[PDB]
């Protein structure tokens, strides 16, 4: 359920989205990064094929925000360009993923952070959200 209270939810967390991806869809992840975090990930997957359409992977040790896709059982070429690394240990964060026609747009704490051109093209097959790593998850919502 969108708006379910995830305060005590163990990582990894996995959820079927009620409405899958498509133009106009929005998913928000609210949580806190552990003060002793090394990394975490938020993935959007196609539940049947288990392809990962969008892999979002903040790595705290090197301050890199890694994005990739796992298609046909292989990781693609990573995207790492950032204006700034928008996470910090111990911080509350809000990450918003908006699905546009040609790309995802991802915002952190209310500020646009990056675009990710769709590699997995069949958007409405993207029906699953998985989250894992060194965070306290508070809530996920989608609309």
């Amino acid at each position: 359920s969108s708006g379910e209270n995830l305060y005590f939810q163990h990582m990894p967390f996995a959820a079927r989205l009620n409405t899958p991806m498509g133009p106009g869809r929005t998913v928000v992840v609210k949580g806190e990064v552990n003060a002793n975090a090394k990394s975490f990930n938020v993935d959007l997957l196609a539940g049947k094929s288990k392809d990962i359409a969008l892999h979002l992977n903040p790595r705290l040790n090197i301050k890199a925000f890694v994005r990739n896709s796992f298609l046909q059982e292989s990781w693609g070429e990573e995207e790492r360009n950032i204006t700034s690394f928008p996470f910090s240990p111990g911080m509350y964060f809000e990450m918003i993923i908006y699905c546009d026609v040609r790309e995802f747009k991802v915002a952190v704490n209310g500020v646009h952070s990056l675009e990710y051109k769709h590699r997995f093209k069949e958007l409405s097959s993207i029906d699953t959200l998985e989250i894992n790593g060194d965070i306290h998850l508070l809530e996920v919502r989608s609309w």
Binding site: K30, E94, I96, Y98, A107, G110, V111, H112, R141
Partner: peptide
């Protein structure tokens, strides 16, 4: 209300 402390730049 989506309960966004930082707002939504895509709205």
């Amino acid at each position: 209300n989506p309960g966004l402390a930082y707002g939504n730049p895509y709205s």
